[PDB]
Amino acid sequence: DGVGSSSGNWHCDSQWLGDRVITTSTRTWALPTYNNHLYKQISNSTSGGSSNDNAYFGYSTPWGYFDFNRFHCHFSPRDWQRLINNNWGFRPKRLNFKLFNIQVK
Amino acid sequence: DGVGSSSGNWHCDSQWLGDRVITTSTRTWALPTYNNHLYKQISNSTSGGSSNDNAYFGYSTPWGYFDFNRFHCHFSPRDWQRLINNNWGFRPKRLNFKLFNIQVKEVTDNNGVKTIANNLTSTVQVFTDSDYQLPYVLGSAHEGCLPPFPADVFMIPQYGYLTLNDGSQAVGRSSFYCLEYFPSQMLRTGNNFQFSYEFENVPFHSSYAHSQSLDRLMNPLIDQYLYYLSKTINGNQQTLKFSVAGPSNMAVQGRNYIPGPSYRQQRVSTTVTQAAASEFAWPGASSWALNGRNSLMNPGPAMASHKEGEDRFFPLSGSLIFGKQGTGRDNVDADKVMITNEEEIKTTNPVATESYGQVATNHQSAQAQAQTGWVQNQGILPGMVWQDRDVYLQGPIWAKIPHTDGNFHPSPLMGGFGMKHPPPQILIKNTPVPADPPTAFNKDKLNSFITQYSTGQVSVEIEWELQKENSKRWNPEIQYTSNYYKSNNVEFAVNTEGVYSEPRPIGTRYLTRNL
Amino acid sequence: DGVGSSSGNWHCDSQWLGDRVITTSTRTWALPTYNNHLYKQISNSTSGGSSNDNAYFGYSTPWGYFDFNRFHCHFSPRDWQRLINNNWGFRPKRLNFKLFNIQVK
Amino acid sequence: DGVGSSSGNWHCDSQWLGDRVITTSTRTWALPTYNNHLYKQISNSTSGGSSNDNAYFGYSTPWGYFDFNRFHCHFSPRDWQRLINNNWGFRPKRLNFKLFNIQVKEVTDNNGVKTIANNLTSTVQVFTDSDYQLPYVLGSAHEGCLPPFPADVFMIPQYGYLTLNDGSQAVGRSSFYCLEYFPSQMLRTGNNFQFSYEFENVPFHSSYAHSQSLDRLMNPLIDQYLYYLSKTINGNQQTLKFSVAGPSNMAVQGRNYIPGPSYRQQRVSTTVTQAAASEFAWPGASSWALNGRNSLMNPGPAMASHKEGEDRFFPLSGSLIFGKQGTGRDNVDADKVMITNEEEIKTTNPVATESYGQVATNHQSAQAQAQTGWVQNQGILPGMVWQDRDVYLQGPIWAKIPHTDGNFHPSPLMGGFGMKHPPPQILIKNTPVPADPPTAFNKDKLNSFITQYSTGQVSVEIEWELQKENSKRWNPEIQYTSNYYKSNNVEFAVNTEGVYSEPRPIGTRYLTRNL
Which of A71, B362, D78, D107 could disulfide-pair with B371, CB 3.0 to 4.6 Å? Predict the structure, then answer.
């Protein structure tokens, strides 16, 4: 939209329906410049590794990534307690993801 | 909207309709960063407290909150004078609240010099506790409300709350609340926030003083058809004598209703050149105990401050005490504070510094003389009538009724309107803006942030319902009025240094009506 | 109905809906003859009482009565645990009562 | 209905349609009072158990239950012979169950003599665990099923269950179930009970024996286009030689599929006049451990009982052992039991008393000779094929698949059809009838009851789907047949004392099909 208008609101809550629970979590993030905008070949030689079992070859990218693959990223301790004390099972169904209020310094 | 467009106008006025008055007030606020964006556990150990009665456990939040729970936040002195001189009662009806003209600033310090600049992309978060899921701190007479003078710029108070405590420690039942676990609107400089609230039905506040006393409701010209025991001994043979209760002996007449409850307070005199037996401020105070902790009975049940002609006396903790402009925080003299009094309710309520009455304590006989005992505290009895504590221009407006199984007459003891669902808490916080992070990933939470604060305007509009007076009284009533006599400054105005002051507390009970 | 036909079934279960829980309990009872079909005046004199504070006067009837004024008559321990761990409050709404399979010996 | 009207008829017949056979069986049952109407906590301490491996904790209920989880409860020997000689497979489809002609009796003892009379007003309670909320005990080969002979009257077994145990003690996770906490129908002498059940989709049972072996699926006339290492040394220089795998060397030919898993069992011989090193029944048995308790691997994975011509050998616990009619409970001779064998699956499954194979255990070199090790237990590998354990006329029909996150090929190891939702447990109990209570109220539960038992008829109808054989085999098949040679008694008939006996276990695998 514009410089002076927020592009999203803070949504962080849990909604408990009959057979469904909807968890929403919002966090503030910071993203630096990685590898000074470069791709770099990496290996156990570059990191000083010696053992065969820990040898590797790969690349480090200037990109970051968002990870929310831990349960506490979505469930508060009270919500987790409710889930574990009141249900025989659970599974994820669908996902909604948002990035907003971008600020570059 | 945009950076260069205002998101709201300055609305500050009072509109007087027939049975309604609408008050609108706008103020400029400043919001700093609290606790450096952190939640902190607090207790009497962290503050150095030692006494059991003052022990606590709680949390301090990085959020601020808006408070307008004082009458002078909405009524000018002239509007208050009109309300109290022309109405028998009033009550809030509905609320409109607005936040606009958000301005977020960044502060940079190089060496002993700070530079302030706009941060147009930063946001401020605001939400209302409409479901009352957070501890309610607006029910206490805390500072930080909107200033009575519209030109004053005020600082938003920091939000904190207390939970169950055992000394300086917590228990398993103690609750921790994260305010980021609530949906909140994020506002840049172009955005605004607003919501509407409807007050639940409350009784009209008694802005009148009774023109009759509870013990003088009879016809002063006609005898009763009831008899009272007038004599027991003939001059130790028992000779019962009965007489008609009439105008000559009003004290013994039968009555249908009795004065309200009491909880006696120690009597303190403001007269200079007086001696005291010892330090009795805490030792001589009336108090109630909860889970082994003693809390001062303050202000306690609504009782008459003093008997007729005894204005020099006030209950030790039974009256609201306001501080004059510029008064210090600790150990100020009596002339630096304003002691309110409730003498208007002496017609129905017992005197705070006197016993409720006398009750028989034995069975009289030829061998034992009749004995009576003083009633220092008297609970509710059928047939009791009483008046609640008066409200003041600088006093509180409402309070949240605690969510309990039972309560009786939940009018706030400090004065005002008790509501199960009062105006919701409005919480505001500056969104943290991290400084430059390291170029290598670190899993720890960021602790380096850009120094920021925010400012803007806040508007609150409240519609009040009025109860007009229909008195048939012939002689003129008592009215609140300014004194014409010359003075260096105008009351309820600014000084030569621009300091606004409220020289006296103003009640609401000047008009009269029958009992 | 008849001698050889049951007049009711054994219903004992708890049904948990969203905002409501329905408890059903069935018990087997035995009813003897009380006071040999007579009404009898009773008092602390008949029972040998002496203290003023415990003096009384009344009547004993040949009738029995059904009482289910205790929570465990309707809630199993597990149902009680669910109720107390998952709800801020509860109250009774309506009642259904049945007597059946009468057998006189 | 009424006292003098039957609530059902005797239905016992088998109907053979084209692809379906419907079996109906009716039996007369007797139900006593169990535990004197009480629930009782039971454990190895109450029964005097000492070993850790046999420790348990559970409850015994006053309820009985109906069990028809054996094939002879539905199939007569002639019907079983038809099924096994004319079909390549079968599976249950749907179920019909009926209880009728309820008769409740009261027993009174005066002095050494008991009198039995009808109690027309008493009730019997029946319900089905359709939601599978109770522990499932029908998945174990327990006694108490409907008798194979329709004329036999049987006693309803008492229902009991086990929960988590630590020695003879329970833990917090242990569960206690009250069967009166379930809705149940109450039946007088005029009432009847019935319900229908649909079997979930299950694979057809393999009622055939393979006419080919897994290692002999190639063309015996044509060479493969693949080579194998035929020689390593030239007569210690390494000289690799390769040869075509053909009919002359079938053992080294490449194959696409391999025999199924194995869990080796100790080999025991039934031949008389044999010596044993020591008592190896428990010490030499294969077993699996769970939470520190050792349980016998019985019958374990489906494996061939013995190699060709070695019928005298049987796995220590890898085969179902049935008892002959009149056989005792403890320490009976071999001639008093019937040892089943699974020789038909030797074409795809490994021998129970032999290693699965040999695997290399080192790297051969000029200094180290190639080494191999025996594989006593082999898990599932890709390309494996196997046959499940055969079912028998007197063997179990189905079992409940345990409610777990994962399972592999949940065919019951004792034979039959594995189902997540098997036929529900049918529980029955006599309603307690209190004796004369005291004329003065006593709050204790009544412990004096009229001695009662109940009897009636039970009918179960099961529809079975058939898989017909479409073989092109020219020579006649092997068929189950009775022996014409004269004998004192007819097999599968009654003796001179009216005792019905099953002289041998009957499998299902007589017809053949290619692999």
Answer: B362
